[PDB]
Amino acid sequence: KRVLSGRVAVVTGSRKGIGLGIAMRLAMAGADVVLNGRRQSPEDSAIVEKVAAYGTRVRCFAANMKDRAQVEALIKFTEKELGAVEILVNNAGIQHVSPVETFPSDKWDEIIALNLTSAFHATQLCLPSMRQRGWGRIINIASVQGLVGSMNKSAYCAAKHGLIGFTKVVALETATTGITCNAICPGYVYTPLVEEQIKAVAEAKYGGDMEAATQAFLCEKQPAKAFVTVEQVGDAAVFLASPGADMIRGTTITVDGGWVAQ
Amino acid sequence: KRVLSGRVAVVTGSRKGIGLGIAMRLAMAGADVVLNGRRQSPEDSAIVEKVAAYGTRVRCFAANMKDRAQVEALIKFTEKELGAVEILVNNAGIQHVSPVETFPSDKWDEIIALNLTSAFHATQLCLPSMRQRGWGRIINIASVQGLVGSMNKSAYCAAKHGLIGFTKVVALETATTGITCNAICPGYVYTPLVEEQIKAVAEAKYGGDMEAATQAFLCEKQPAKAFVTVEQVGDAAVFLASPGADMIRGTTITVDGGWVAQ
Amino acid sequence: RVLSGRVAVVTGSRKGIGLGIAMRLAMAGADVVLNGRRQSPEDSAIVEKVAAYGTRVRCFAANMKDRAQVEALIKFTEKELGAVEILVNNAGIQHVSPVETFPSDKWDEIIALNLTSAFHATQLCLPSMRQRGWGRIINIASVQGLVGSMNKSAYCAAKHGLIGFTKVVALETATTGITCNAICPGYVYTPLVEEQIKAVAEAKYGGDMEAATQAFLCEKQPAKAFVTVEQVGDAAVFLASPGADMIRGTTITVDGGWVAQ
Amino acid sequence: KRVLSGRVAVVTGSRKGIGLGIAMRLAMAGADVVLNGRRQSPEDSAIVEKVAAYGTRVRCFAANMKDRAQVEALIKFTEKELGAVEILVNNAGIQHVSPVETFPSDKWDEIIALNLTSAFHATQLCLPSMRQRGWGRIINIASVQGLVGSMNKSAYCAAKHGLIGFTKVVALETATTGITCNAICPGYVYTPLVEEQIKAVAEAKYGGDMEAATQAFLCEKQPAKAFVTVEQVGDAAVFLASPGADMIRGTTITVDGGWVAQ
Ligand SMILES: NC(=O)C1=CN([C@@H]2O[C@H](COP(=O)(O)OP(=O)(O)OC[C@H]3O[C@@H](n4cnc5c(N)ncnc54)[C@H](OP(=O)(O)O)[C@@H]3O)[C@@H](O)[C@H]2O)C=CC1
Ligand SMILES: NC(=O)C1=CN([C@@H]2O[C@H](COP(=O)(O)OP(=O)(O)OC[C@H]3O[C@@H](n4cnc5c(N)ncnc54)[C@H](OP(=O)(O)O)[C@@H]3O)[C@@H](O)[C@H]2O)C=CC1
Ligand SMILES: NC(=O)C1=CN([C@@H]2O[C@H](COP(=O)(O)OP(=O)(O)OC[C@H]3O[C@@H](n4cnc5c(N)ncnc54)[C@H](OP(=O)(O)O)[C@@H]3O)[C@@H](O)[C@H]2O)C=CC1
Ligand SMILES: NC(=O)C1=CN([C@@H]2O[C@H](COP(=O)(O)OP(=O)(O)OC[C@H]3O[C@@H](n4cnc5c(N)ncnc54)[C@H](OP(=O)(O)O)[C@@H]3O)[C@@H](O)[C@H]2O)C=CC1
Question: Is C155 a catalytic residue?
Fold first, then answer.
């Protein structure tokens, strides 16, 4: 047996990036895991089998988290295939870089919908079963951008700040139960979400030099002058899901190479 | 004669409650002021005359801040009547008290729309002029609930946390200019928004005794065991609009009787 | 003039931020006692400059690291002007060093002045404020009390501690007419900062103070401009005013955006 | 075999309370551990046996952490007996409850000396070896009282806030190395430090009723209405010491039953 053996986890947006790192670490720690993205992909079999390599039950369910009916379908699918959702990781999220004056109205709305409101919908749908069973984990993937601001990220900083506020309330409403709710706040992790920003910097300011752009990007914000890894974010999710975190409630686990310390 | 003399200010949701207090204190400090609520009222002329007793130019314009077109209409009306909007106070806000599990989906969306997204829309519309003119104040009325959580207020805490995150980004994007953006975080103020909550507490737990319910309501959260006043919130807005706050950027002015200190 | 008649003491206030605060308090109508370690031939001129605003101004020499001298400053104020109603704990020092080589004596001195002396002064002033039903304790912290910076371990510790102390004092007085709050400035161009820029200029920029000043400022302060002593003074006046009767245990951060990012 | 196998840890003030829970959890995770208190005790051998139950090397060294020369002796003793100090846990701490007006000067000084300055001394003495070896963990046991204030605990809140500020600086000065520095912020844990406080309020206010005193003590501050355990604080220290925390730098891990979330 392992520390999360028998626990059923759902990780939204988890076929790539940080979500896949979290799903891998939870499965390595013994949890059954449901993967998720917007639409079925040819890679689903290979990604399921990668996560299943550690001897737990793994599934994959395509669902757009901005649609509350599809969030519900994801949860019901998990209940049918594996059992009650015990660990919910709200991870799916998007970014759009723009000054406030020209920030597209629909991009603002989309970031709020996915990065904040979808976590509320999923949490609302999962809490009754967790309360009935006397146990739960809700793990929200926020950001350093939920604790401080950065230029040209108004919608994202707003949504991530909001997600941290939501985390606090859910934790307080469950504080006398076996359900906890907490947020992980990563600094920069080298995923496509960050790669696309570095590419824009490279083209705009460094003649296409990705190495120069990466160092500048990273060093503007992250004192460690290194990226956080998806595995490290997964390790924080395992820690929050473990029994040693039974009394960690409504807080942020910041994994950011020193960004918020300065 | 007075520190804000000749400044043109728009205060959203300002015919009653905190917004009216803010409009009054800004006018007292010399600002011309545009009042605002969702729909025209028979009291509009009386409320305008009350604010106009401070000897500045006062107007009133009905505009539902959840409708971006009406936000634009409010700004355009102010520009036509008084001149460019120099001080923008994003104050209009709503509350709904409910546990997360039963929180109505459309009330969540409404709180996010007004308490967060409306402030983004108004700020977006006002910033280009402020940059051209070399001066501006964006003052966001957040809450202690933007810095900590409280039970049964998930949507509101999320929106107010988000508003504070938005404040930081706007301030950073304008940091080298004469435009500042900051948030005021009141604790409990005795307005209808709070009176309705106390009424519910009185009915549920105190047999209708509003005095007992008020003391319990206050002393749960607010160490001063007294309410903040609308005038005190207005005085914080006057401070933020004044030359002494030229280098106050991206921060919170918390007026809460000690709530966040503990 | 919103502070008419109030007696204020500003520690370390013959230059820098403290002088800016004393000036603004006097402009707002307060009587003011200036302070520094040792008597200065410039004392008379500095008092006259603050007295230009028509209030009662005194100067008393007292090393704030010596509790007995802190007491002498409070007693002097009580006999000369009356009860201390506004206490501004401003005197402070800096020492820049990596942790490994931080001198033990400098660590102790920074804690003693930047944190413990504020406790001593507050303890001595609170009984009178409680008796009279009114008081303002204003602690000059820093952005370094909310975030860390390299080579400033003792100072960040002391300033963090001063903010913690502020919260407790405010909570213990929350149902009274006494408030306690902290002001957190970012960089202000005083000798405390100029000495650091000089060291940077010599180390990295061949002595060029204009280049060094920009590099120093822009490392931390998004406004790319200094906060001014007048602005810090304006924050003190705001906290001392009736609009701030319910501002308790908080930080007023005047920092050009430093803590926002 | 285990995650901290081969690492040499020193935990100050570790023969009872949270320090012992941390020492136990570090040894369970494979670390060799040096225990410490002010003076030799007849109980020392039994405490060593408790920690040595997990099959690692254990030592005990009496040293008053307020005396820099004894701090140095503890480090040199560890270097002689087990090897280079790789994990430093600054845990020893004291409390004194008093209003500010009557807070004894000597007590204030003692709390600052132990709860803040001792950690600086120990960190200063351990950092050179850690830098030479390219690895280290400095784990500072702060408190919720380092993030918010509580009545009658002025010295302690000041020292704990200061410890968190110190943590940030050390982390920033080491951010590009394999050395991290972080703080753990427990809420209430039922150690002798808290039990003595509850006994005192029980006699002074609750007629000797320890159940009533405990209910009031906890429920004033801690939404979970339950104590954090020494084992949970130990688990957080193990997490910070593990490779998954290589990029956790200058932050707080708050284990508090929701105290700071509200
Ligand atoms: N990378 C970083 O530096 C940091 C990232 N974060 C946060 O971590 C989380 C993951 O980010 P990262 O892995 O970097 O981003 P990626 O863009 O690399 O991966 C995004 C993931 O979200 C999924 N997704 C996007 N939209 C939806 C949707 N509407 N419904 C369901 N799934 C969706 C994608 O699935 P598919 O494309 O298959 O539909 C994909 O799995 C985000 O919340 C981000 O804010 C936080 C801090 C730093
Ligand atoms: N009261 C408190 O204790 C605290 C309040 N706050 C904040 O202060 C702000 C004001 O709160 P308070 O005065 O207490 O609330 P009130 O309910 O007392 O007044 C609400 C105001 O908002 C206006 N309003 C509501 N919806 C809209 C809309 N869609 N478009 C335009 N105006 C609108 C109302 O105008 P009309 O009805 O005329 O259309 C009214 O003027 C809010 O942002 C709230 O979150 C923050 C902290 C504490
Ligand atoms: N400058 C900045 O960028 C910032 C400064 N601060 C804080 O503002 C406060 C003032 O700093 P600043 O004005 O910049 O520093 P300065 O060095 O310019 O002035 C320091 C003042 O403290 C007085 N002083 C020093 N030691 C003692 C003592 N032992 N007893 C009494 N008075 C003493 C000096 O008086 P004399 O020499 O006449 O005895 C002098 O008036 C400090 O607490 C500092 O930490 C906070 C944030 C930013
Ligand atoms: N209990 C709680 O609720 C919380 C505690 N904390 C912190 O956790 C840490 C431990 O607290 P707790 O375990 O509760 O306190 P305890 O009083 O139960 O244990 C205190 C420990 O510190 C040691 N100690 C005291 N003074 C010295 C000294 N001068 N030199 C060396 N060792 C010393 C004692 O050793 P001996 O007596 O054997 O010399 C004892 O082992 C402290 O830093 C405290 O602030 C933080 C948050 C909450």
Answer: yes
